[model samples]
Target: KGEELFTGVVPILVELDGDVNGHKFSVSGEGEGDATYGKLTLKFICTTGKLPVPWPTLVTTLVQCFSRYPDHMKRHDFFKSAMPEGYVQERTIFFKDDGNYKTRAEVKFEGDTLVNRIELKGIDFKEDGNILGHKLEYNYNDHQVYIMADKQKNGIKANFKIRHNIEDGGVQLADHYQQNTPIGDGPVLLPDNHYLFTTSTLSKDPNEKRDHMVLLEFVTAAGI
Candidate 1:
């Protein structure tokens, strides 16, 4: 229902009416508090899959140092190296966690239109301790990766309600920071805007876009 007062995700939305296998979609965002910046303005574009910085590099950076919050992810060396300057990028990974717990989860809270949702569950060593049978929910329209943990375990609960935009098709798989240029090959050199990385595919029709971008950022925040 809201962002963590200290550490958590904050999605910046935009107004876009793009097509996913012919399914008309729009981009936008909502927050649970005053700390803000979910208004995204597209800046970068990625056509042809071949990246200026190499796609593998982007995936590696996130796998090693992905964060659930803006400021938190900003501090990671990987984030500093990948996202380009002045780009207040929206994360391709909208909702996920490691091994924490949750009492409940509503993955489909708003019906067919806005189906992103999550519920946090605190750790309970006695009963539902470690997360099990986790599944991945990678939303292609939003480029949001999710880790669906077992709800019966001890954990926190929250739903990911996300919106998206189009950028030559590739969206930065992560979020925010002060902004700057990385050492080299940062996804910011697309002959377009100074920032914003987009992820696209070869699927022209909505049904043809079946395989969900094939990158699932899996989940449950197992922590202190």
Candidate 2:
């Protein structure tokens, strides 16, 4: 019986296919790189209890999961440390507030197919009173890909749209900057193609003294 396979004491890697015990099953993405941000290598480990389900179904489920929470569970320190070179100071100088500011990402799954769709939602604040929002959509096929920027703003709403298409497994990325008011400090640009922006007065000191701070560091391919 299929249940017998679960009783083994030793851990072993076995591959099987199809609907063996009345249910189709698949195993995928077991390694660490699959969870890293930015450029990553994903290892797909697929097996079924019975006969193989359509590859399209398996691929579609994987894509849907990735699309919904593409940026979830990433090492924040990895991203923070990966900041180019000169951007290090900018992080300290800009993020000097003590308020509770947060950055979040949300993903939505649109359909089931080899070609699937997903949307990304992001919000962030550097200080207490300031807020920003952005939304992006990605649609992909086996051989082609599409991305659309749906919304972006700092304070006032700036309606803009950008689209890109890639073929043959190539990826196209768009960097769009939209400012709310033309006169104020809108958003800072970073060196590594990552944006650098700060919100103001979002945090306050209890004793009116300098707020408590913590620093963390990690190693990367770009040296310490």
- Candidate whose TM-score is highest: 2
Model 2 lowest lDDT segment of ten: 86-95
- Residue lDDT tens for model 2, 1-224: 11111122211121223232233444433211111222222333443322122222222222111111122212212222221110110001011221111111111111211111111122223222211111111232232112211234212211122222232343333223222211223232211111111111112225533222111111111111
The candidate that achieves the highest lDDT relative to the unseen native structure: 1
lDDT of 1 at 124: 20
- The TM-scores of all predictions, comma-separated, are 0.20, 0.21
**Model 1, runs deviating above 4 Å:** 1-11, 14-16, 32-75, 80-224
* Candidate 2, position 168, lDDT: 37
Candidate 1 has a TM-score of: 0.20
lDDT of 1: 0.24
lDDT of 1 by residue, 94-210 (tens): 222322222111111122111222222223222221112212122333333232222242111123332322233433222311112223333322211112222322112245222
* Cα-based lDDT at residue 41, candidate 2: 25
